[PDB]
Design a binder for this molecule. Structure first.
Ligand SMILES: O=C(O)C(=O)C[C@@H](O)[C@@H](O)[C@H](O)[C@H](O)COP(=O)(O)O
Ligand SMILES: O=C(O)C(=O)C[C@@H](O)[C@@H](O)[C@H](O)[C@H](O)COP(=O)(O)O
Ligand SMILES: O=C(O)C(=O)C[C@@H](O)[C@@H](O)[C@H](O)[C@H](O)COP(=O)(O)O
Ligand SMILES: O=C(O)C(=O)C[C@@H](O)[C@@H](O)[C@H](O)[C@H](O)COP(=O)(O)O
Lengths: 283, 282, 284, 284
């Protein structure tokens, strides 16, 4: 049933295809820093031969605290993304928080992401689907893997069949996430084989009961990225930073950028292996 | 412990007699809304319970694209205007987009932040700025000690009239549990905001492959009794004369003819607990 | 009808439509005099308020996390202490049983035998406890859904013991934490033919530090949770106390300070008496 | 360094940096010939692929939900069957132990003793198992966080047994369901001085109907989950199989169909060999 989603020339995501890296940074802060980090990803993915889509958010619309950093915002963010595409020739993914942002974002971004908390919001999902690019649906922490089909259906109803499904963990007691590795197959099979993507970064989130900003578990990114990629999936979603303690959002879960090549060579080796091993029909 | 004045004769607070935020899931038509609200007004008047009428003008978050959404903003506000004028009752409704807050606030007396949207800064701020009391539905994914940050967003733009509404926490897949310990944690970490218990939505559960929410209305009294016994500012309740025919959340709706039987138990328990001291257990 | 009553001792019968029974005491037996002194306080408070009473203590803590944590006086001394409690006060006692071979000797002295939470699926232990011929209090494991207790009740019934009570102590909620699902009480009663349901408010307050070596706990919130449970309409409350919970040798973080016993129990009786005279609604 | 190796028998050593050891077999001993036949299949497949092998079975299911469910041949017959398995195939065997007194006799025959998941906090059982002198496989309870196993390991260490392995079988996730937190493996290893971590893929697939009599399970997804766990880099995989899982008398819903053993194990070996030669990254 597997379905393949064409993102840009030489970049197609599909559960039986070599994995695609949706990699970048949490939030857009400035032009040069964005260009410099993206340059590193482009060089590392080109060297290793891994298909690549650059990620960043133009806005963090859901920070816990009114005081926390939100990013350069829509207008500056789209200008940064336009310069990233022209400099590197790389497709970009970003998240969309209001219906009215979908069309202008889709002029520049090559994939639009539905945020986890907002994936049940009909008018947002529909507006994102109608914008005419591939959609990455972040699976809410509150949503079981067999319920994503209804989000996919919303998109399908307005003529967008290019939908990918992104795991980022499930709520496990208070202030913690677990990743159910059994969910990847349930997402694919109940949606007609949509590409499934693993957000290893956000799956590492956890928090202090009284904290102002998310905690996170970057020291375990390889453990979890290994597990997910071994299942056999369309993509990996990853954020990095040269010094994660200085990141202005989700630093506790960000990969230190100098370890990108070390992580990706392990992902490519595991992915190339599992992608040539059969499923067993276990009845 | 902070008290929130909602309208004449209606003030909510954790040490005050509980306020019923009662009504129906979704606005469908004028006359049915008036008739159901009439029943709540009659029952609450008889029993002496303060009352705010609830309904949604839109269900913006249905699982399925094919599920019923309600009459929509323009018709919904017209219905509410008529409900207020006919019965003299304040009304609560939920707000899905920033731009809806100001027009909703012209008519509604309390604005509700939907559970899924409670982290959305621009929505919360827009709701806060509209200048009415705010009911924040606690997301299924949010711990009770994290609501303070939503309250602070509202406070930052000058709205100190914030209430916090329990509707359950995610418990495995497709199921909710209510942690009765969370009420106190919500109150104490937010400077004493009124805590409200949404017994209806706390009863939600679902089939892994279903198209619409399941629910456990047959257990509404068990859960309502438990929550009201803790000592809380309000109870949030939906009903329908025939819940199997409700177009949203019927599985968790109270059958309307049982409203008085339920409310007399809530009033009896609430009046008792509200005159019993806290023990300072150290 | 819809509800089964369990006779424990003269004037003490537990049932879901009856005035609640207090299964109250201390976590672990340490010495004769301290046990007698604490039980005396319970007896005086319960007599004054008119609450039926069964005194609780463990003779052994067979499941401490750490090999270095206190376990109690043990079986032989524990039963001697319980005999002296019964003779001094005329009160029935409840204690937990950890091995099949302990059931018969414990039943000579104790009036209710408790199956520990972790052990409730262990067929031979349940069957040996049922056979000893006293009422059984089954602690619902943190891992067990409320609709699965019926199988434990059936094990007991299979060897001729119909006198089974079901005790809530919370459900695992992520790591190192418990939540009490107040919807479970009815599910336990209805799927077992109306067995008495008991709420262990003390152990339901447990939680822990991920690296700790003994349980944490939330005694400051005992009244919130006890009020909630008793309002549902249940057969009993299970409660531990200590005069200084910080010095308790097991489960101090969840123990009620003993001087607050009367303040708590007067709230429980008031709520219980109210809800026990209010009808169920048949909600269809 | 950072990792401890446990010698089980000649040519079988389990350790987190070593090629993975398969603890494979059947849920419950029913008869001699069926046990021999199934073990023969495992031995042939593991010999061909070059995977170190320990044969698993239970002599008793002491924790069935239902008093009517099958329990197995029992201790005396079970040890006789194990003796024949060892003699015929030269393979070491692992079985679980349910009472302190069973530890010594089991240890005469079995090469690894397993502490059942529900019982892993029971001090006297853990100590008796540790004292019996063989390697211990601790099944991590569904209710226990990964950073709490250290206390079980310490109980064993206290009576002189340092040969302890830690076996994941899922964590309680709501009612009647399990999830495997793949982050736990490292936490178990690092907090216990590098004990071997083992993944029980079979029992991690358990789930149930709220009103059912016996466990449900998700065998159709065994490869997904086994791939994920083995990719993390672990000491062992624990697996049950049956030639026709629908007819298995315990845990059939989670059993691998036996004819698929080679297809599964070749994937495990390929993944394990790859990850075992790739470095950890020191992520700060
Ligand atoms: O940007 C993405 O890709 C996302 O998935 C959204 C994600 O970055 C955000 O939800 C952040 O995790 C979130 O704003 C951090 O929350 P806090 O640190 O404000 O508590
Ligand atoms: O109306 C309220 O007060 C609310 O709490 C919002 C609530 O009614 C909605 O989230 C509904 O519960 C929801 O749309 C039902 O979901 P489904 O039945 O479409 O799966
Ligand atoms: O005695 C009872 O009533 C029980 O419920 C058993 C209970 O007391 C015990 O499990 C204790 O809670 C337990 O041994 C203490 O845990 P820890 O502090 O050893 O981690
Ligand atoms: O034998 C093993 O390997 C184990 O882990 C113990 C395990 O087999 C048992 O807990 C069984 O899963 C259990 O007896 C079956 O449960 P039920 O079907 O009786 O509910």
């Amino acid at each position: 049933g597997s379905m393949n989603v064409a993102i840009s020339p030489g970049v197609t995501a599909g559960n039986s295809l070599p994995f695609v890296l949706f990699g970048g940074i949490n939030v857009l802060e400035s032009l040069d820093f964005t260009l410099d980090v993206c340059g590193e990803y482009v060089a590392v993915t080109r060297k290793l031969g891994i298909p690549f889509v650059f990620k960043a958010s133009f806005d963090k619309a859901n920070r816990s605290s009114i005081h926390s950093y939100r990013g350069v915002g829509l207008d500056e963010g789209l200008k940064i993304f336009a310069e990233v595409k022209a400099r590197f020739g790389v497709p970009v993914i970003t998240d969309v928080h209001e219906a009215e942002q979908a069309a202008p974002v889709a002029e520049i971004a090559d994939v639009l992401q539905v945020p986890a908390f907002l994936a049940r919001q009909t008018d947002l999902v529909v507006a994102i689907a109608k914008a005419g690019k591939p959609v990455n649906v972040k699976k809410p922490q509150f949503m079981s893997p067999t319920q994503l089909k209804h989000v996919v259906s919303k998109c399908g109803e307005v003529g967008n069949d290019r939908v990918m499904l992104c795991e980022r963990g499930s709520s496990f007691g208070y202030d913690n996430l677990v990743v159910d590795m059994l969910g990847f197959r349930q997402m694919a099979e109940t949606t007609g084989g949509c590409p499934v993507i693993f957000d290893v970064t956000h799956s590492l989130q956890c928090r202090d009961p009284l904290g102002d900003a998310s905690g996170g578990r970057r020291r375990q990114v390889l453990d979890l990225a290994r597990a997910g990629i071994a299942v056999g999936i369309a993509g990996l979603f990853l954020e990095a930073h040269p010094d994660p303690d200085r990141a202005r959002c989700d630093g506790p879960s960000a990969l230190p950028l100098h370890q990108l090549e070390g992580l990706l060579s392990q992902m490519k080796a595991i992915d190339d292996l599992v992608k040539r091993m059969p499923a067993l029909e276990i009845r």
